[PDB]
Design a protein around this ligand. Structure first.
Ligand SMILES: [Cl-]
Length: 173
């Protein structure tokens, strides 16, 4: 299942990583990539943004439509165990590098002393090109899967082992 161009157009450079437009007003990312001490995000003052973050998942809901080109899509708290997700990793050049992952259990974990409310997954060696998810710049990339004719987003990239074989997305409680 190939994420279509419009779905990739939601993936946006943010802080030290990426985030994702769920709708014209809702942007999600991983908390540790969010810049701090700033007065605005995407030009909008803090006073016009409703922030909801917990467990390394950050959601911003802007008061104004920031990406009216987008439809609203479903954001879920993780996905059923065994779901194959695509992690929509972009690189700075604009190259698209989707990573296929088989999802495991949703749980609360501590990672580098940070509480991560997340879902573990395993990289699918057999569905990915050899030689992703293992550099700081990849955090915040969305985990998506296709349900019927619709794509669902269910987490943001938060952690991975040194090898990248085991990953964790933060999920919204
Ligand atoms: Cl889309």
């Amino acid at each position: 299942h190939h994420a279509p161009p419009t779905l990739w157009s939601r993936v946006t450079k943010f802080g030290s990583g990426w985030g994702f437009w769920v709708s014209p007003t809702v942007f999600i990312t991983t908390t540790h990539v969010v810049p701090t001490g700033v007065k605005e995000f995407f030009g909008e003052p803090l006073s016009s943004i409703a922030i909801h973050q917990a467990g390394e998942f950050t959601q911003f809901r802007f008061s104004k439509k920031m990406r009216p080109d987008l439809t609203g899509m479903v954001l879920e708290e993780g996905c059923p165990e065994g779901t194959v997700c695509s992690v929509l990793i972009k690189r700075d050049s604009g190259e698209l590098l989707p990573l296929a992952v088989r999802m495991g259990a949703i749980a609360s974990m501590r990672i580098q002393g940070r509480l991560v409310h997340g879902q573990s997954g395993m990289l699918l060696t057999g569905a990915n090109a050899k030689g992703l998810g293992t550099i700081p710049g990849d955090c915040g990339a969305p985990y998506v899967h296709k349900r019927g004719n619709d794509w669902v987003v269910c987490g943001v990239h938060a952690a991975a082992t040194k090898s990248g074989n085991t990953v964790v997305c933060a999920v919204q409680a």
